[PDB]
Amino acid sequence: SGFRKMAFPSGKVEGCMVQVTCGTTTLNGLWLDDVVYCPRHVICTSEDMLNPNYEDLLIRKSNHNFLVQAGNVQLRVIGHSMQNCVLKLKVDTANPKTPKYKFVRIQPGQTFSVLACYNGSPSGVYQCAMRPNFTIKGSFLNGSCGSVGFNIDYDCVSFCYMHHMELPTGVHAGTDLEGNFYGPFVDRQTAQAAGTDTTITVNVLAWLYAAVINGDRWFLNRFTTTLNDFNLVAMKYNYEPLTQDHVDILGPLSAQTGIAVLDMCASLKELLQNGMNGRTILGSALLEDEFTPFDVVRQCSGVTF
Amino acid sequence: SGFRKMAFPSGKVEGCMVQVTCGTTTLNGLWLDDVVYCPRHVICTSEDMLNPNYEDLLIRKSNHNFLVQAGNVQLRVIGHSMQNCVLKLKVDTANPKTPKYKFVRIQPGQTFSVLACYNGSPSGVYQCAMRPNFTIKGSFLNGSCGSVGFNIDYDCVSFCYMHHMELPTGVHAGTDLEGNFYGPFVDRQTAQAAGTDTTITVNVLAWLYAAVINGDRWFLNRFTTTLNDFNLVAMKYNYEPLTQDHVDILGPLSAQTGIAVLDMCASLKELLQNGMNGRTILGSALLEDEFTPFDVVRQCSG
Ligand SMILES: C=CC(=O)N(CCC)[C@H](C(=O)NCc1ccc2c(c1)OCO2)c1cccc(O)c1
Numbered sequence: 001s002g003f004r005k006m007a008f009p010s011g012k013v014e015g016c017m018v019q020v021t022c023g024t025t026t027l028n029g030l031w032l033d034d035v036v037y038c039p040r041h042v043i044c045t046s047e048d049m050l051n052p053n054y055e056d057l058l059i060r061k062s063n064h065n066f067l068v069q070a071g072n073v074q075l076r077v078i079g080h081s082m083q084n085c086v087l088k089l090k091v092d093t094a095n096p097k098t099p100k101y102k103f104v105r106i107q108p109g110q111t112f113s114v115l116a117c118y119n120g121s122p123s124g125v126y127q128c129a130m131r132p133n134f135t136i137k138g139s140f141l142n143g144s145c146g147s148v149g150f151n152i153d154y155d156c157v158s159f160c161y162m163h164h165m166e167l168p169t170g171v172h173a174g175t176d177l178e179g180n181f182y183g184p185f186v187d188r189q190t191a192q193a194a195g196t197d198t199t200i201t202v203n204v205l206a207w208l209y210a211a212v213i214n215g216d217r218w219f220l221n222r223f224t225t226t227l228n229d230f231n232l233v234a235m236k237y238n239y240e241p242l243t244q245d246h247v248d249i250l251g252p253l254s255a256q257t258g259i260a261v262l263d264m265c266a267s268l269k270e271l272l273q274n275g276m277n278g279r280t281i282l283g284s285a286l287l288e289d290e291f292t293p294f295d296v297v298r299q300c301s302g303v304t305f
Numbered sequence: 306s307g308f309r310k311m312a313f314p315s316g317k318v319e320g321c322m323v324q325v326t327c328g329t330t331t332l333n334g335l336w337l338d339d340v341v342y343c344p345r346h347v348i349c350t351s352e353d354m355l356n357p358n359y360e361d362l363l364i365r366k367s368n369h370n371f372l373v374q375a376g377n378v379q380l381r382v383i384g385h386s387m388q389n390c391v392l393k394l395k396v397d398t399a400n401p402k403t404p405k406y407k408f409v410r411i412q413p414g415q416t417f418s419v420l421a422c423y424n425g426s427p428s429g430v431y432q433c434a435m436r437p438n439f440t441i442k443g444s445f446l447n448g449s450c451g452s453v454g455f456n457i458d459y460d461c462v463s464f465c466y467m468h469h470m471e472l473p474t475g476v477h478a479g480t481d482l483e484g485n486f487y488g489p490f491v492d493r494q495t496a497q498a499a500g501t502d503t504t505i506t507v508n509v510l511a512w513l514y515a516a517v518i519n520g521d522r523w524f525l526n527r528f529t530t531t532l533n534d535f536n537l538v539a540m541k542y543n544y545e546p547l548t549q550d551h552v553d554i555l556g557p558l559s560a561q562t563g564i565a566v567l568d569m570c571a572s573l574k575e576l577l578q579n580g581m582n583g584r585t586i587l588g589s590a591l592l593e594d595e596f597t598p599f600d601v602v603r604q605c606s607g
Contacts, residue, residue, distance in 0.1 A: 001471055002444040004442075005310060006429035125311070137309070139308055304426030
């Protein structure tokens with residue numbers, strides 16, 4: 001029993017984190033096989049980050065201008081190369097701790113674990129959602145750039161996120177491990193803002209299902225509804241449309257508790273209009289949207305890695 | 306920027322998680338050098354749950370009654386003993402992945418990371434606090450017993466909790482790694498009294514200091530308060546007494562924000578009285594007590 005913001009065990013990723021230094025800029029890289037992945041902006045001085053030409057800045061730079069530290073051991077670079085917004089440094093040694101892994105791109109609403117690192121040393125781990133506006137509400141200070149986000153599926157680490165930069169609202173922006181940014185952002189010290197963020201309806205519903213499975217039942221009513229009727233309520237309260245796809249995904253939790261989804265939507269509908277009337281759900285006054293259906297099921301079934 | 310409940314990197318603890326089996330019972334164990342530590346209730350049968358006699362159940366066991374599994378490898382048990390409520394199994398292989406470590410007994414209000422495990426396989430990692438009533442609000446299903454809580458300070462892992470049981474209210478009781486329970490709990494399935502939970506006052510104050518450091522001052526006011534008058538108001542909201550020691554401990558965060566501790570107590574007082582009128586602090590619609598003064602310093606600089 002119990003329900004918490006649960007991160008994946010970080011041991012497989014801790015073994016891949018290294019320090020990447022270029023001039024005075026230090027930040028984190030991911031060392032898999034003989035390649036070190038990190039943000040390309042490690043080749044930028046404070047002057048050059050205002051309006052950088054990366055291909056031009058990179059063409060100057062040679063292998064010996066990149067210091068890579070894996071703990072207290074030096075890795076010699078023997079190849080640099082750019083893919084979209086990530087720098088690929090080839091090194092003389094394959095990482096003996098390379099896990100089974102893949103690069104994947106997550107959708108808004110999907111969650112992942114972030115391993116925060118400073119000077120290539122992991123400091124902490126936490127669970128995140130890719131927001132609809134493609135930002136993450138992380139906790140990064142200076143030197144956290146190159147920190148990665150990941151899911152584990154059996155023995156396989158799926159890397160989905162590399163931290164690049166902070167926005168002025170205190171939220172964060174980054175790429176997939178193939179250097180493609182999540183959201184309409186660019187790697188440049190500049191006036192960039194997050195769009196109007198929305199609430200991930202399917203996640204809130206999944207977390208209400210987690211409440212019911214943990215004995216919190218006070219928000220259930222006798223009333224059902226329709227997707228069309230519920231979505232008009234969602235739109236009004238800055239909630240994502242709920243799709244037939246989302247209803248299918250909530251199928252296992254709808255079966256395991258005997259609450260329809262349109263039933264649970266009716267509950268959310270009423271929670272959206274009338275508020276929580278001073279009560280809480282899973283020790284929260286606001287509706288949590290950073291737990292997927294899969295996250296709920298995995299934690300109320302106890303799958304291991 | 307940002308403020309998230311941050312667990313420690315679980316890697317050094319993942320390397321120590323093993324499976325212990327005795328009869329039909331299987332739970333997790335902690336493999337450090339040549340010793341495996343687990344809840345002694347692994348040796349209880351289903352009719353031993355109410356009034357187990359551990360000395361009498363243990364003397365009827367030999368080494369080969371304990372199956373220890375470290376991944377697919379079987380560890381060889383060459384000795385066993387009991388210390389308070391943990392079973393200590395001597396094995397013939399020292400854990401090669403043994404980090405630098407110490408065992409420490411924490412006080413209520415202190416925070417740690419839990420590695421939740423099943424069959425000696427880590428499932429997830431989350432941060433939590435020792436409540437004043439010596440329970441923790443964890444996430445723990447059947448078979449999670451022997452999961453450990455810890456802090457990492459440099460290279461050194463401080464083990465402070467091993468999970469033993471769930472109480473009828475859905476909160477979790479466990480022992481230190483010397484096998485002494487936190488709170489008035491015993492490894493019996495008798496009716497056990499989960500004492501009245503209070504809010505960890507010194508933690509809420511730290512989290513308010515953290516909100517100021519991330520540039521949020523909307524909850525401050527122009528009042529100060531005496532320690533005693535603050536505590537008379539706080540008890541009425543089920544808040545733990547704030548002591549002089551708690552006040553000394555907040556000194557650094559006071560100095561960083563230029564807000565005296567008793568000025569910040571004045572804020573909380575007013576916060577308790579008003580609620581938040583549709584506002585949030587560090588993303589929360591209630592007052593967060595699961596971050597310590599030390600946790601806030603580690604995660605904040607502004
Ligand atoms: C009374 C039932 C109960 O305690 N439950 C079931 C849920 C209430 C599990 C539990 O706490 N076992 C710990 C334990 C094992 C053997 C013992 C013992 C205590 O005392 C002596 O012999 C339980 C259930 C779910 C999760 C969990 O962590 C523990």
